[model samples]
Target: SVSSIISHAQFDRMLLHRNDGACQAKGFYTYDAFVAAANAFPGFGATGSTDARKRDVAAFLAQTSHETTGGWATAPDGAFAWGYCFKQERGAAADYCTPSAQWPCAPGKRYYGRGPIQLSHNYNYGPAGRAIGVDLLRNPDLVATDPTVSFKTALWFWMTAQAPKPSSHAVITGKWSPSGADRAAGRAPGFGVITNIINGGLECGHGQDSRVADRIGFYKRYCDILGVGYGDNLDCYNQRPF
Candidate 1:
């Protein structure tokens, strides 16, 4: 499962009125670029060449959730003004991950939050750029001008690394596990946590509606698809600090 899974059809139904799907038409690369980068990156979202099977949907969920929410902003008030984010770099706060509190240089922080996950800080941003062939260190603003750059960078960061192992969605619940049994219990990484972070706890931020009440609203919908695994003590949100 890749971002395409969400961008294609899931987001339309899940977001309902607010579906502005996908940053790129296909992906960042052209035929030549795709082959070269795909080979270099050595994976598709979470699925690798060795695994052969599609990467676990859980991995895609974790990767996106980590980068965008952990680094980039989420909905209601994301880094972007329009509530959109870039895959490669930070664009307009309305269009990308622009933090009113930090970012924009001389304004306090420098490249603090960027890309879909908002890979921040000088150290993380610089290396991410190097891997993706962008000079984010010199001009982090390219994230805005070049959306694909941010996406490629994020892909590099998520797919290539040794993921924090034996993870579960229970981190939000203050618990951690190795077997991911809690994940099966609907507590970990269910649509609940994804909505919580992605919506900034404001997905159902519209009054007291049962079906769509802030975080619960966005979460419940995901539950319908993946089923609520509350008993599993799942925690999709990663506890480890990057």
Candidate 2:
């Protein structure tokens, strides 16, 4: 279980202000919720060697931290410590619905970024809900209201393959190898490829980018806590995004 790898205390230390009252998600994002959702995936952090499992959990939270981060430079315990600060996007005013056949948007519903991964769009919400046994297409706000479903959706995104790009779990576990075309695109195994799978189109290929740096910073901090060496290719710099 994820709690076995990183206990509740460890989770608090990793994300210092997640449960603070002033934070938006004050009572949300509990360690219990995270652990409960992670175990649903079965092989998430439980695959491979002990150290491999640690790295996987650390990397997973590191990425999640970035998605929900509210830190700024020189904040309390520094910037990376301020993850899980918000359950939903801050001041999200725009509509996140998209016209689709497989995952059509519902009337009067908005699929704005929510939960740990800031899951957005009808397509993602629909499939994520189907996997978790929740009807997210029509009830997208459930991701913001239900903590277990929140983490479950993020884990679903982490574990499931969206075609073309391999799952982030495979990318980080070193189970998926880059093809010749992937090599030409600068895709490589390790955390960077996982970043590519998620939101590389917005955060990768540029050297010294702040968004990518934020992700790496969270990863480095989590790896330090987990006592695991971060594998190679830490950034998506020079890699074409999906």
Candidate 3:
């Protein structure tokens, strides 16, 4: 279980220090919710040895932290401390509904980014719903309204790979290796590759992107708190996104 590697006490303490009450997701997410949702995926937090398990959890939260962070550089405990700040995208411009034959958008539903990872797009919602048996494509709002469901969506995304990109689980657990194209693209096996998998198109292959730095910062901080050393390849500035 995820709680085995990361106890509820450790997870809550870390999040309580980071979560700002002013954030939209205030009173929404909880340590129990995270743990329960993680365990629901079976082999989720048990990816590798104890240290590897902890790192995987840290890596997963780091990306989620960046997506939902509400902290600034001068914020208390530094900027990286602020995560789980919002449940849904603030002032989302579009409905995020791109028509797909495989994963059709539900009627009158907008797949705007939501939950820990801000999951968006019809393709994502369709599959996530099928996996979790929650029909997210028809009820995307459930991701924000139901804490367990919200956390489940995040974990689902973490565990499932979307072609061209490996699951975040594989990268964190050292189960992924770079291919010839990945090598040529400067991709390697590490946390950085996971970032590339998440959103490298927007934040990678460019030197000194602050978004990428924010992710690394959160990861390093969490690794320290989790009593694990931050692993290599912490950034994807030189790597082409998947």
Q: Give the winner by lDDT.
A: 2
- Residue 9 lDDT, candidate 2, scale 0-100: 83
Can you write out model 1's per-residue Cα lDDT over 1-242, one digit (the tens) per residue? 34432333443333232223443222322223323333455435334222211222233333343343212236443322121222433344333234343222223335656554566666665567777776676677665446466556555654433333222223322233434543443334333333333332433223343212222323334334333233231232332211
10 residues in a row with least lDDT, candidate 2: 89-98
Order by lDDT, highest first: 2, 3, 1
lDDT string, candidate 2, 57-76, tens digits: 88889899999988899888
Clashes of each: 33, 0, 0
Give lDDT tens digits, candidate 3, residues 147-206. Answer: 899999999999998777889998889888668999899898888988888889899998
| Candidate closer to the true structure by lDDT (higher is better), 2 or 3 | 2
Of the candidates numbered 1 and 3, which has the greater lDDT value?
Answer: 3
Instruction: Give the higher-TM-score candidate: 1 or 2.
Output: 2
Q: What TM-score does candidate 1 get on C-alpha atoms?
A: 0.42
Total residue pair clashes for candidate 3: 0
TM-score of each: 0.42, 0.96, 0.96
